[PDB]
């Protein structure tokens, strides 16, 4: 929770309007220090101290993040009003946006890389013991170079069945979010289950229906979704194993 001081930053143009309140572009230039671009979320106006309190505790959370695929906290805007938590900018704004706006324009070989950023930023998080429990492509950012970082600091297509009948919410649960997040990379942004019903979903995963492999899938890819996707919460692989394994699939391109 490092102090930045309101005049190091410029606020430019809207990006969002986000839970709590907007989300801003603009930039950070320190003394001394080259500018960066920066997002610039603020709580929506006429916020309580209580409000207030809670948007900075959900800022002390991030910053004990400090990892290539979570998103990064420049710092907090706590001594002038209003409050502000500046974070790094991602460019190309959401994934699922992102896909599905380059639909077909990326090789499969680009959407395991960015998998795998995915995964290796969820093990971080599993390791340090933090579940997240909203873990879809529309909570996903990607700067310029493609890099995919984690941010968002009960949606039931992405929320695995022992996170949709009994409140047990994992590293495991997890998992089965993240491989809805491969169905929906694979597919270029599909909806996962398309129309269904919240409940149709619920009753046809309990008699055993998974997603069908997204158009031009490796049959590898889409059986690691499958793993994801075991009913049973330890029969899933992990974040360490998911990692391993498309880290063997970006070397080996055969497996694909």
Known sequence: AKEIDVSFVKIEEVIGAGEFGEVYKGRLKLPGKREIYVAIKTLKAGYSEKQRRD???????????????????????????????????????????????????????????????????????????????????????VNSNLVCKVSDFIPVRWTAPEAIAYRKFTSASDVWSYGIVMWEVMSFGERPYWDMSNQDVINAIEQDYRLPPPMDCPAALHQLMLDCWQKDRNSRPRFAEIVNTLDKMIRNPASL
Do not use: C, W
Request: without cysteine; hydrophobic residues 45%; negative net charge.
């Open 55 to 141: 948007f900075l505790s959900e800022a002390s959370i991030m910053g004990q993040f400090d990892h290539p695929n979570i998103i990064r906290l420049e710092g907090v805007v706590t001594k002038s009003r209003p409050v502000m938590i500046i974070t790094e900018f991602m460019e190309n704004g959401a994934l699922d946006s992102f896909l599905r706006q380059n639909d077909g324009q990326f090789t499969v070989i680009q959407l395991v890389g960015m998998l795998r950023g995915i995964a290796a930023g969820m093990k971080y998080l599993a390791e340090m013991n933090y579940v997240h429990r909203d873990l879809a492509a529309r909570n996903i950012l």
